[PDB]
Specification:
part of a larger assembly; 4 chains; C: 467 residues; mainly alpha; two-stranded antiparallel sheet; 21 helices; D: 427 residues; two-stranded antiparallel ribbon; 2 strands; 72% helix; NADH-quinone oxidoreductase subunit 12 (chain B); cell inner membrane (chain C); cell membrane (chain C)
Chain lengths: 54, 276, 467, 427
Amino acid sequence: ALFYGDRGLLSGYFGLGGAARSLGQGLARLQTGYLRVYALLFVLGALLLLGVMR
Amino acid sequence: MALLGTILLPLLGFALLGLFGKRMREPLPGVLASGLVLASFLLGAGLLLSGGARFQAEWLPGIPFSLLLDNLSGFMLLIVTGVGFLIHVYAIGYMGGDPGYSRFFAYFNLFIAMMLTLVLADSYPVMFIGWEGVGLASFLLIGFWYKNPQYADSARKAFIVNRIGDLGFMLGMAILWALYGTLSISELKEAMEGPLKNPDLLALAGLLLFLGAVGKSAQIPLMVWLPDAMAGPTPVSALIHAATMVTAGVYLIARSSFLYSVLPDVSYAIAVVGLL
Amino acid sequence: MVVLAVLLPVVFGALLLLGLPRALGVLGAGLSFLLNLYLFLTHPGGVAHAFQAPLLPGAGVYWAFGLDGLSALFFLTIALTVFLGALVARVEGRFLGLALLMEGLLLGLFAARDLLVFYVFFEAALIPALLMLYLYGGEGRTRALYTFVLFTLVGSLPMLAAVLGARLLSGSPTFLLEDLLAHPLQEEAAFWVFLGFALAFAIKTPLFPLHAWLPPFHQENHPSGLADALGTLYKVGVFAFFRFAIPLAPEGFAQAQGLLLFLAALSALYGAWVAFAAKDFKTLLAYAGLSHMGVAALGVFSGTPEGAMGGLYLLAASGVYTGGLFLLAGRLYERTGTLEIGRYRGLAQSAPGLAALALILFLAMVGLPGLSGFPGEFLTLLGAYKASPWLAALAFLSVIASAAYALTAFQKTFWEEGGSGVKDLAGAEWGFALLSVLALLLMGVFPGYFARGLHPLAEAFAKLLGG
Amino acid sequence: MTLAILAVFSVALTLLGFVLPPQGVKRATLLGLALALASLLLTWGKPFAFGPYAVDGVSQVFTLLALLGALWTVGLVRSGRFEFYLLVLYAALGMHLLASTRHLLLMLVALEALSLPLYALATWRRGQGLEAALKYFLLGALAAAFFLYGAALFYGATGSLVLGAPGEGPLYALALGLLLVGLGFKAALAPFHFWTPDVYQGSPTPVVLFMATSVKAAAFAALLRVAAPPEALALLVALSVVVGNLAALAQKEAKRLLAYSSIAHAGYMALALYTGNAQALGFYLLTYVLATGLAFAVLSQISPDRVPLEALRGLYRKDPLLGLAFLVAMLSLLGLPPLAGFWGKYLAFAEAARAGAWGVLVLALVTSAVSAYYYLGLGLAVFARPEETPFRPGPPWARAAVVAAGVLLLALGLLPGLVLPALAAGG
């Protein structure tokens, strides 16, 4: 019982690996390839920074 | 130093018969074994008749290696080495045409050495070396003809059920460290005279010492391990059930006579378990 | 002096990798063994041969070395185990070089007299390990590798903040251990830094929830288990705790102690208990290692110099008998071709003296008195019991589970009815055997002599937790 | 007076290439760049300022790096158009100017100087290379606009277009922000990073070597000159490292993966920006430039247009030395001991923690561990069984280059007490 529990533990860690992978390709999905997309994401980011500065 | 010799001879012999031993003619491992055991009894009885013996040596800090040979130790020593020797010679007889004569008498010497290590101890961890050691040699002999499945698992069960007891022994032993800090039976007894302290904890230590004793002397609930010790060669069963082993169950209490003589509850229970 | 003993296996490994042939690196590990032993005997004290050299003068990182009462045998132990790995071996990849490299690396690890250098070695040891893993065998090689490596690395990189924080928040001029200890961290500064040491140290110990990498690592290396044997000498977490984590930021450990003792206990019990269910040598030895480490850590965490000395000792010796069991397992592999426990039963009649060798090793493992395990296990029991008795107790339904798994394995591998029959013993395996038995017997019979250097360190760094 | 050498060779070769075979022009441009670097060594500890133009320890180190990158990238390119050298020359001077001044407007002009000729270097003319070039120019000119209005607002809050002027409250804050925008974009910090994946994948590989080394170098050089506040620094770092590594996980392609990775790396270097140590940063970029230059030289020896991750595999068997070197590059870019990449990372992290910014440092470090996935996913990928893959095994030029670069890497991993003694004043 404790053995299988441990196996399952290992599998859950794999779960985190895949969560970071997934999050990653969401972030990689953030880039569509359309230039207008990159431009809007751009201005967005910059306004975020200037907001942070105060 | 002479006191240690008694222990050393059926180790040196054990080591000859385990290491070589198959390099010996069929009588010889029996002859060696029985010979080293022969003058262990003899050469330790020389010590006993001379009034006593002592040994103190380097080990874990705070826990030196201390052997005390007195009346209580000597009585046991004579029983073990004498009857043990008789059983050695008998084993020279009953073991015949059986390969691993070497193995057998190696195991035999070894056993003798271990028991001598157990009963001569002025410190409980040395006593414990004795305990686990004798449990081990029992394991080893009980499975002597290994080609049989039934006489394998026997010894396994032995050393497991028994290690429950050894765990009790360890725990109780840790209990009297935090408490006193000696762990040498003589000074541990001389430290237990007077008012004592924290009686609940002392009773616990003695109770775990007993939880060990139950395993070693085959009382209830750990009773179950002994019947299956039939598996080994008969003189092994002779050595375990009479002259060695279970007797140490009693002896641990007897050296601890100081400890239990002040514990009414525990002793009541001991008698109850004895009766049952 | 020290640095030579540190460097000797490192060079020999290179000479094995590119260099030819295989055989020389064996006597290389032997030489390391002899010198490390030589430094072990003739030791003057804490300083031994001191070493200081500029590394980044402006940063404050210097090469700082010496042998403690601790660093000491660990040179001997590691040198030994790895030497056996060299000789009995049979991985013989020309990565016995990767091994000697790893040995030397660990030697450098223990000798580090300053934090950042220690850090450097700590991270460096990873590479051969991954290599002798990756390119030297296993089917699931790459995923097991990412497991072991990423566990260690995710643990590791944050600690640099603590090693910086240890220097920077304490205003220590350099990374020198002496200096760092001379400037203690305050409350809820020492807290964060100790914690940051504690994660990286816990994951490499291992303790209970974080051990999940250990079974995959040991399975996929080259089956002789040279890579594995050296992997177990890489289990150094406890040493790092006692030497670094606790003394630099003890105030946090005061809070964490209950939890650490608990985890040590549960690691021990769970380890030995789960070990039972194991169907192969790699996994079995893994969980067993987990139990032992549980015990050691239990010893250290209690304060109480008794338990601590027990912990470090148990560590040192268990490197040896575990690494030994690994090499031995591999050697029976090469002759058989399988690491499975159930199949191929008869051995004992067939194998003349192996039953004795493997038995000796296993007896050392279950912590039988007279062999290496018991002194550490026992002293540990004492100290653990001093701090938290309950956790000593839970941790000590260990011996039962330990004897269980060990005896089950030994019986089913050796004692029963004949198979075909097996190869007797190799000439490497003989040196391996005898040397092993010698080590185990000597550390078991005279736990006094070894660990005398452990004793001052034990009680002083225990009182470090006092007033 | 390295500037002298640069302007001279560029202007001269312009007309000379009419009379010279393109190879003769290659020989020329190569010679010029190497000579400029020579003048850089002979001036170590000789810092020199003329106009808004100023050469100091920083200019010295960072243009040492940049010049190195330019030489390596020209080494590979054998196209029989003399301009495909000329443009590189131009760009190089432009980067030198960028690192060499505090004048916001001269900085602007320098930015155009370095950036315009790379747009043209983006064309192998492969259909992607035009898309890449396009995105690059549009986003680039946008950032031009920003850095310019920034200079105008700096001149706004204070009497000068030169950096270091005393500075106001909110308007000054705003102005420093508007400088930070362009200067940040040029360094591939997130979330300004979007171009990076597309352009590295789109442009011909050797050119990308040039960019990914020289450009990042010059950009951090000019960045140190700016006064940037802790909170913003925190943001940029966090985003760069997170999105960089995470999205790099998603990468199936070597160049693009390397782009995202390089976003994470800009993220790491930005920590040095907390104290702006520059002995530390100088070192970091030394290590990084060597490793990356190496990596892209190898990616060039695979294919100019695109390299997938598998292509990297079995590289050890094919050429042992290149496999090993690529491995080392992956580890130095991972920031693992005992490599110079570890000391660069450490020096940045050290300056970071020295500044007492903890959470940021931690995140950076954690996701830096995340990066090991793909860094080993390449470095080890070297040893797998080779699949069908294009391989052109170089001149002695490339073999000796890549191996030299690696050796320089690990040398300073063990002995930074060689160069680090003077990344400072130059002792």
